[PDB]
Amino acid sequence: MQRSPLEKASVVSKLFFSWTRPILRKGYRQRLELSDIYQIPSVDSADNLSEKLEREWDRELASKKNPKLINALRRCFFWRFMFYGIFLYLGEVTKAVQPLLLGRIIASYDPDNKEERSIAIYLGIGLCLLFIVRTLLLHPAIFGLHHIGMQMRIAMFSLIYKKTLKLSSRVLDKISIGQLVSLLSNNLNKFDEGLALAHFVWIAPLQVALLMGLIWELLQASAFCGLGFLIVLALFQAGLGRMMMKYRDQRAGKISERLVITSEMIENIQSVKAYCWEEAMEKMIENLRQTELKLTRKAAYVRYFNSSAFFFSGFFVVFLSVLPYALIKGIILRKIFTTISFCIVLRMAVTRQFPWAVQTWYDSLGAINKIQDFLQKQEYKTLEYNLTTTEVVMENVTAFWEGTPVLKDINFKIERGQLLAVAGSTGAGKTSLLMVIMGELEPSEGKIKHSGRISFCSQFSWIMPGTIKENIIFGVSYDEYRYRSVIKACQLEEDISKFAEKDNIVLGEGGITLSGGQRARISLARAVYKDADLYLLDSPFGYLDVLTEKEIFESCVCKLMANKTRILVTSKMEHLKKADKILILHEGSSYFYGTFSELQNDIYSRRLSQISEEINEEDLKECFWNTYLRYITVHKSLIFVLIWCLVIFLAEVAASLVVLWLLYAVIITSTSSYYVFYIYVGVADTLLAMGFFRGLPLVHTLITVSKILHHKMLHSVLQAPMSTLNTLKAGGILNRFSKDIAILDDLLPLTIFDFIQLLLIVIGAIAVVAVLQPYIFVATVPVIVAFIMLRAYFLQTSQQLKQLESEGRSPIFTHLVTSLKGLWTLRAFGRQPYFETLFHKALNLHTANWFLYLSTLRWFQMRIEMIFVIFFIAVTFISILTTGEGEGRVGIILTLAMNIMSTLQWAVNSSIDVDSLMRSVSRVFKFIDMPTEGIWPSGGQMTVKDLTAKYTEGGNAILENISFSISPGQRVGLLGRTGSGKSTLLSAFLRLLNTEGEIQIDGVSWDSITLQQWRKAFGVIPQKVFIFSGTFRKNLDPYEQWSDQEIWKVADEVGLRSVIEQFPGKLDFVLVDGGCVLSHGHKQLMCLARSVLSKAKILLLDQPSAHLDPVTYQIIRRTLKQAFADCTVILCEHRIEAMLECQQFLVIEENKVRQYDSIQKLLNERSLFRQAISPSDRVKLFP
Amino acid sequence: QESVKEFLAKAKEDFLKKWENPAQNTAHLDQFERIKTLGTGSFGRVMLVKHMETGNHYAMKILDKQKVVKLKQIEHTLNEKRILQAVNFPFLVKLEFSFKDNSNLYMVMEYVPGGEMFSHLRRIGRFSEPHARFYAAQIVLTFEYLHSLDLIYRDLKPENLLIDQQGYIQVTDFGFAKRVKGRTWTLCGTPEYLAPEIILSKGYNKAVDWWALGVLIYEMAAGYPPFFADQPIQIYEKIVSGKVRFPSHFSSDLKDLLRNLLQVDLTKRFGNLKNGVNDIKNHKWFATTDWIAIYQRKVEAPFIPKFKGPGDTSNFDDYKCGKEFSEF
Ligand SMILES: Nc1ncnc2c1ncn2[C@@H]1O[C@H](COP(=O)(O)OP(=O)(O)OP(=O)(O)O)[C@@H](O)[C@H]1O
Ligand SMILES: Nc1ncnc2c1ncn2[C@@H]1O[C@H](COP(=O)(O)OP(=O)(O)OP(=O)(O)O)[C@@H](O)[C@H]1O
Ligand SMILES: Nc1ncnc2c1ncn2[C@@H]1O[C@H](COP(=O)(O)OP(=O)(O)OP(=O)(O)O)[C@@H](O)[C@H]1O
Ligand SMILES: CC(C)CCC[C@@H](C)[C@H]1CC[C@H]2[C@@H]3CC=C4C[C@@H](O)CC[C@]4(C)[C@H]3CC[C@]12C
Ligand SMILES: CCCCCCCCCCC
Ligand SMILES: CCCCCCCCCCC
Ligand SMILES: CCCCCCCCCCC
Ligand SMILES: CCCCCCCCCC
Ligand SMILES: CCCCCCCCCC
Ligand SMILES: CCCCCCCCCC
Ligand SMILES: CCCCCCCCCC
Ligand SMILES: [Cl-]
């Protein structure tokens, strides 16, 4: 990764952007490599910009009564902004005075104007100098303004992220991932471009004041007749912009909900496939889309009328100001052409530059105010720090999650080195107690006192991107001895040996590659590795078999950290026997507190806490024409509209040609009749403008195209095989469903319109002029060739850089998602600076590509203008020298050709912008082309023969040559060690992975019927519970099949009536954040209710009762006995008591299944597993 | 306002009086016992003493004449004696007697039983912001008093700050204090607490004490100094760079105050500006501080050391050239 050549470049090299030549030379010939990307300049680093902005923001908060973020930004970027504004203004002033020099040159072709011919040479010299001074004043100022805006955006993003990690737990419920992703996605690219447009809000009035005084000396009092017309048009545009803003503000709210639903449904795709819910989710997403597309169409209709003002004013501005002059006395053609020349610049200043600047100010100040509102939300309170406490005391603590208190007068006291066992039923408040201790739930009454050094293990396992070792170490120094001891104590040593890459296997966001108990043990290892005074273990033995549970409890909790204070949430009696103190909760009340006796009546030596923030080759590695044609032919109405536009264009061209061939208050002589073509070219932008019979259907159809493409993209994503989906990342999916969709909906339809309009104007002018005089086309050919060649050269590297920049946005969103998912763990451990450094690295990664893209674009634009200037100089001098004692016929042709090339240049820039926008369409089509994954059930008899399962086509096999049979209506127990492959078999029944072999149900082979028919025969309870945003009723049946009577009956059977009635809207309460208001067991009951509602003959149950207490398990047992009488149930579970109600057993060991009849026969062989059975179950199994 | 302005002038007038007519040879080692050994130091040795003719316990600092002349610092130890007997402030360790024998030099201070601030800071780990602000107010008042007399202190560190029975600060170790009205070029002090202009080997003024105060506040609030490198030569590069990062638990007001105190550009540093010491007093971080109550010692301390008698020293750890010395 090389140094940026901008740092050691010359003044002349920087002025002309010649330092970008090597990358353009490299990319034109062959594909860009990783080494080509340069290290970012020191000024653009996220760390430096964040410090710069944070200093001023803190001073603003500490020294003002009404702090404003705009003041903080002004004290950082004002004098460089005003510095480039002056040179932008001086380059614009040059544009207004050009007709004074060029008009006298054009007039010199007429032999009458003998005075102008005496000084033509000096006028030519002046014009040649004017072009050179103009081209050097504009582009560096625009580049500097872009650079300032990019720096401002980076600083604000850093401040937003640093605020996110401090947000209180009470305000977090109101902020979703979609709102934050919208807050970052909207300001990403447009904010940098807006800084260049902002200065015209004061440049344009001064240009109008100059131009009105210049036109006044041609037309004494008649100029105000057109000035009033332009004033009325400006008021009209100021009225249109407000309607556009109103529609945008109304639309803003639905996109966040759409984004959160889409992300939730894609990250839980396996549950959606198992339930066969794809169509329902598509229906919800398309219902959300249908609402916002109306607002999008309305805003596009308003923006069309705003955008077409420039073209539909070219004729009336000059007509209304020339007609009152021509009547009272005659007018010559020269004065009319000069009036047109000034009116072009006047119209461009009034109807194009001023409203864009005003809208840019609106958008910028609105974004800044919204970010300021984010930065002042309520914050988390940091705990008291005191190393000399060594005592955990709670007294009279009552708390509210808001009603009924979740906690009600809890008291306990534990000393250094003791173990506390917290027990209770589902929903008693065991997790809320640890939340109170951690400081995430502020008590309304009472006190909690401890040292302030804590380590936490959540009941839901959080896995961050990286390897297993990075997950366990978690941002501190690697100590080998403690690492080995902790790995050995947590029983992870066997599972790591199975992986081909051992401990360095890379895990994704969420760790879906792992099993439930593997994730639980990695989280426990992360907790244990950290040195703290208090350990909060929230039910770690939830997905573990009895033997692994016993080993971990006996060799990790009671032995490895016997000198540490620790609190264990558990229900097992054996665990309560070894506890010093026992606390039993019952509906938030202390049912019992005391000792078990009265109930029945070395590695932590070193201080490892003690990155780089810059990107290297490793970080950059991840980032590394039948698209127009495919985009057009999506919708036939677009083809019809384009044909309509073409026919009207041809009719207009024919009419204008006839009228021009056909050729008082206007004075015209034989030697001055050449002004007709000049005036026609000057006013052609109005005779060829597309009216609302052509402009509105085009935008309407262009929006319909994007609607169709979004629908296809969602459908293609939901149908892909699991092997493809596992490789995708959350941030990439969010990027492609947010940024590309927004681009296809807003920017592309109105940019294509301008490009087509400019093309039609240029082509019509060229055709009409060349028909009546063929020498103009010959003159225009070489400049067209030069522009086309330069464009072809530039796009080769521009497209690659644009693709790299588009791919660079994903890691930012991935980090944001993984940061929001694990915020409580981050604040418990204290790893905020680590994640801040990682976010800075991601920002620098994006900046490295974005800066090069902007630099090469500036280079291209400057070269195009330089080519134009050199051609103009050559033709100007040729014209001045060629004319003799009579008519100068060469100069007329040459100057008219250059007047057409002036518009051709703007058409070329519009083409470059359209090509830039089409990359998002390319990426969407790339996502659409994903490969596709693809009464009878009377008894439930199953037969399996030679079944092989594997997750990767050509990888290791998890199960090999499995064969067994199941009688109809039989309960079968599936048991085995953690990570042995119990879930793999159940996924193999549904064909969710690469499977080989044969499975028959009631004689019907699974190769006979389609996959959708096959999956509809099964009822499932996935190990990971999927809950989406919506009411209880919508979560229970997205298809809306069953009435509230049936839902209430099932909820009463499952035991959810009391839980549902707890909330304000009974069955109408909207669940947010994946059911954050529910306990862990209430989600198990929700899954049980879903399985009961769908009447199926074969049931695949994947540990239905993971974390439940023995009392709540009776609900599952009763439901199994009653609701599923004549059904084949395959019950995979670690609970020993659940094996009593089974008739056949399957044991997975050594990558194959062994079949047993009775549980006693099974247990008598594997003695070591039988020794781990608790005495309460031992008397049951051996009566 | 006037109460501060009228009262300072009286302190100046009183200070010059004892600066001119001093007293020497107050006592010799006959009435002193030898009980404990409170401290150490790179030059001296401090041991507990009692007067048997009165019974009151005192501290006594012993300095070696030969070592003093060997260390090439003779004016500093005489200027310490000269200044300590002239100043008068409730947050400064007072002086009772001065010794003169043929072997060493001894001084008699008051006994401060609560021990160092350093030991308690390392024991607790870090102070909360109200706890740190309570001490910072006292240090601000002490520097305002000292700078009124054109005195630089020039050695500020937790080991020099003692806690008395009521919980208030007592400042000691005036070994580097000098009466500067203008500029000075001597390099002395502890490397973590040195200002950039001291490292750059150029003239400096009383503005260095505000840099030292900023470092002290940072270390109290975070528990470790802002510039921490394992080698003294590497510490200087971090100091001259002047780049600091704040812990996540720091508040915005504290960060703003520390940025204004740890300012490399000495023309922009607080306390050296046109307002003098009022940018610090009026800062938002000191909004809840009563500058009169702190001076009069009516605010209850957040920490009271558990001293258990005049002879108890549990808070502490267990431990010729007559021409040059003509002012002892
Ligand atoms: N964010 C929240 N908002 C409102 N109520 C909540 C919230 N989180 C939990 N609750 C309620 O708090 C009560 C106790 O829930 P908690 O999760 O603490 O139970 P638990 O004892 O840990 O359960 P389990 O055995 O299922 O793990 C429940 O009634 C639950 O609905
Ligand atoms: N998507 C995947 N890609 C690769 N390997 C996987 C994937 N999912 C699971 N595995 C591997 O399959 C093996 C068996 O895991 P599986 O989840 O089937 O076991 P289990 O018996 O259900 O576990 P547990 O008791 O923890 O729920 C493990 O070694 C795991 O790493
Ligand atoms: N009045 C006092 N009461 C109790 N202890 C004291 C007193 N004066 C000094 N000490 C103890 O003596 C220790 C060191 O003494 P002092 O710092 O005065 O000598 P020094 O050689 O100047 O030290 P330095 O190395 O900082 O220059 C102090 O840290 C403190 O423990
Ligand atoms: C950028 C702005 C502030 C520059 C100055 C604007 C005003 C004062 C300028 C701009 C154009 C100028 C006019 C240009 C041409 C003529 C014709 C001449 O026969 C009399 C002066 C007169 C009528 C000028 C008067 C002053 C004028 C109106
Ligand atoms: C920004 C100042 C530009 C001055 C232009 C003066 C034009 C004079 C024209 C006289 C006929
Ligand atoms: C921006 C300066 C333009 C100077 C134009 C001078 C025109 C001279 C015409 C003489 C008849
Ligand atoms: C919007 C300001 C326009 C200024 C016009 C000035 C005209 C001056 C005419 C002098 C005879
Ligand atoms: C009569 C000769 C006029 C010369 C005008 C030159 C204008 C130079 C503008 C940069
Ligand atoms: C584009 C401007 C055309 C002006 C035509 C004026 C005709 C006047 C006839 C009296
Ligand atoms: C390259 C095009 C040159 C055309 C010159 C035509 C001159 C014609 C004079 C009537
Ligand atoms: C833009 C085309 C320029 C053509 C130049 C022709 C020169 C002819 C000299 C007689
Ligand atoms: Cl003219």
Ligand SMILES: [Cl-]
């Ligand atoms: Cl003209």
Ligand SMILES: [Cl-]
């Ligand atoms: Cl005129």
Ligand SMILES: [Cl-]
């Ligand atoms: Cl004119």
Ligand SMILES: [Mg+2]
């Ligand atoms: Mg819980």
Ligand SMILES: [Mg+2]
């Ligand atoms: Mg499983």
Ligand SMILES: [Mg+2]
């Ligand atoms: Mg000392």
Ligand SMILES: [Mg+2]
């Ligand atoms: Mg000293």
